[PDB]
């Protein structure tokens, strides 16, 4: 009956015991959780139930829940930042609501009002706002999660669902003053996503398949997987991050390149922001364009590569120093070239996030 | 540290209040559950905990559990059958243990002893014996499920996992129409399509809804530039036809990475090989192969195979705005019904085969 839950209807149950906050200089990503969570029930029969902010607790799930059997699930990732002026800000959160809604449609999970969800998240962050780290390098990670809770074993659109939101303090990925570059494991035997698949959505199924390649990656002394696609060996994504290459292209032009949104690339918020920034600066060519391993190695051979970095919410920007490919270690001169652009981008994005630069990209906490 | 759980140290906690069994005449597939369940806990620090048979209950899961975020999960599907002689039988259950083990490796979930799990399952079915329907048209569906319960949001190999088993009384030609849209691809080479990992299935619900929107019951999964016909929903695809050489042939797509190696598929192949009445070919089949054969009146039957239906005749394919009729039902379907009869006879103990194990 009810098309969406409403922030107006929020039922809040404060915790009676409050946990001590962690040292912001000693945070490991996604391991410590705050006092409270958002939960909202849905059923086909009654529609959306009233949303609850309540103490962080285990989920009680029928063991037949479709999220556990057929990966009927999706997530988001966005952050709250305590500013230089001690104001807490969200960064481009409407883009995450847009993406989550679209992933829900693709998953066949129930549709919701994006502004109502945004306001419920605002209220949850406001309640746990002291968990937003008092550090200009740490932030509060927000994990909205949407699962099918259909008890029956038929492979079908769920008639029961749970939307929930977790909060987790996260620290810097740089340390001792500098970036921590990654080595990438490039094995064309694995594919992250395919044309006709769901790689342009944040559905859980895209990620469970990537764990094997990641373990093999770690066994070979690499931190992330470089995801290759097709007979041409297109470079697509770095782990769970978008791929950027800053180089002199085939025409001899200084260029920032990233793979196009042709269905196998997750449309990152960070990725969009970087494209926007680089276009605005107007200092070099910006291309959404295919990039192969042969393109890369040829350019490296002729000293045309400047930097390679990955982009995502957790780290904003992550420089790439090495790629393990066909039994060889190929060096990327990212760190030797500054990294000039990667550092410039990180500074710009963090300025905005922490309120050093006024931009419409941020929103002050409700 | 503990490499496997063992059926030896099974802890059995029977329910004090038992539920009434459903009418075996009106069962809805996976909607009704028995009194008990198996659960086995794992962690990287201590290895496999002791297994438990206990009352069916909700799972208490950390909201960060990787099964909920990154689909760190797999399942199996197999059945128990109350024979004509009242003996309860499992059917090729070691093949399900083999496949579950493969799926866990690909998923990075902890490995276990296959013989130990089968025995834990046998003890579970044994406890809940009376739930195996008193009907030769019904069976007990067995659902082993294996999930990551790692509380942290980092995308990595789980340090926490839960293995559980559910039991569900299920009942019972009604041919299906297939919706064929090449813009959805079920599986890719370098993917996980040959495992029963949950991630393979979440991505399929949109296509199935679209299928229903158009009066079709299942999706025909197409692959590649040549539009290879691969699987029928959650079933393997069989084509009974006269091939291009003018030979009568049973054909099915080969196991090149994008096809789930079905148990039913295996059994049908074994049987058709044994009979030696027609050619048996694991080979590529395209939409053009099929439409060309249909024009020349060379197609006899098309059916899917899986544990839930055993065999499912196909009457129509909707592809590129066309309605392509398959003469399955106008040809008996004799092969489909022969297979259904054969497997049913073995499953319900009407004939002996090493494929069945008495509980
Ligand atoms: O930003 C990163 N990931 N992108 S993300 O933030 O949007 C994301 C996407 C999908 C799943 C999980 C994640 C997250 F949160 F990183 F865990 C990321 C991964 C990563 C791995 C290393 Cl080793 C270093 C820096 C890193 O940053
Ligand atoms: O046997 C079937 N599916 N194969 S299955 O049995 O191994 C299976 C595989 C993956 C997920 C779920 C299932 C199951 F159990 F059907 F739900 C099946 C699907 C199906 C759909 C229709 Cl419309 C009619 C008969 C049918 O039988
Ligand atoms: C989330 C994600 C991205 C990065 O997206 P952001 O919105 O910038 O955090 C890129 N690739 C994959 C596979 C992702 O899951
Ligand atoms: C399980 C399944 C099959 C059928 O396999 P059986 O072992 O015969 O039940 C076929 N295709 C897919 C995608 C499946 O998951």
UniProtKB/Swiss-Prot annotation, chain A:
Q: How is its activity regulated?
A: The branched-chain-amino-acid aminotransferase, activity is inhibited by anticonvulsant drug gabapentin.
The entry sums up its family as follows: Belongs to the class-IV pyridoxal-phosphate-dependent aminotransferase family.
Catalytic activity entry: L-leucine + 2-oxoglutarate = 4-methyl-2-oxopentanoate + L-glutamate; L-isoleucine + 2-oxoglutarate = (S)-3-methyl-2-oxopentanoate + L-glutamate; L-valine + 2-oxoglutarate = 3-methyl-2-oxobutanoate + L-glutamate
- Key words of the record: Acetylation, Amino-acid biosynthesis, Aminotransferase, Branched-chain amino acid biosynthesis, Cytoplasm, Lipid metabolism, Pyridoxal phosphate, Transferase
> What job does this protein perform?
Catalyzes the first reaction in the catabolism of the essential branched chain amino acids leucine, isoleucine, and valine.
Please give the tissue specificity annotation from the record for this chain. Answer: During embryogenesis, expressed in the brain and kidney. Overexpressed in MYC-induced tumors such as Burkitt's lymphoma.
Q: Coding gene?
A: BCAT1
Iron is among the record's keywords: no
Molecular function in Gene Ontology: branched-chain-amino-acid transaminase activity; L-isoleucine-2-oxoglutarate transaminase activity; L-leucine-2-oxoglutarate transaminase activity; L-valine-2-oxoglutarate transaminase activity
Tell me the GO BP annotations in alphabetical order.
Answer: branched-chain amino acid biosynthetic process; branched-chain amino acid catabolic process; G1/S transition of mitotic cell cycle; L-leucine biosynthetic process; L-valine biosynthetic process; lipid metabolic process
- What cofactor does this chain's UniProt record say it requires? pyridoxal 5'-phosphate
The places in or outside the cell where this protein is found are: Cytoplasm
Q: How does it assemble?
A: Homodimer.
N6-(pyridoxal phosphate)lysine, modified sites: 202
Species of origin? Homo sapiens (Human)
Q: Which domain of life is it from?
A: Eukaryota
Record-given protein name: Branched-chain-amino-acid aminotransferase, cytosolic
Q: Which EC number(s) does the record attach to this protein?
A: 2.6.1.42
Keyword Lipid metabolism in the entry? The reply is yes
Do you know which CDD domains this protein is assigned to?
BCAT_beta_family
Cellular component per GO? cytoplasm; cytosol; mitochondrion
Which cystines does this chain contain? none
Which NCBIfam families does the entry link to? ilvE_II, PRK13357.1
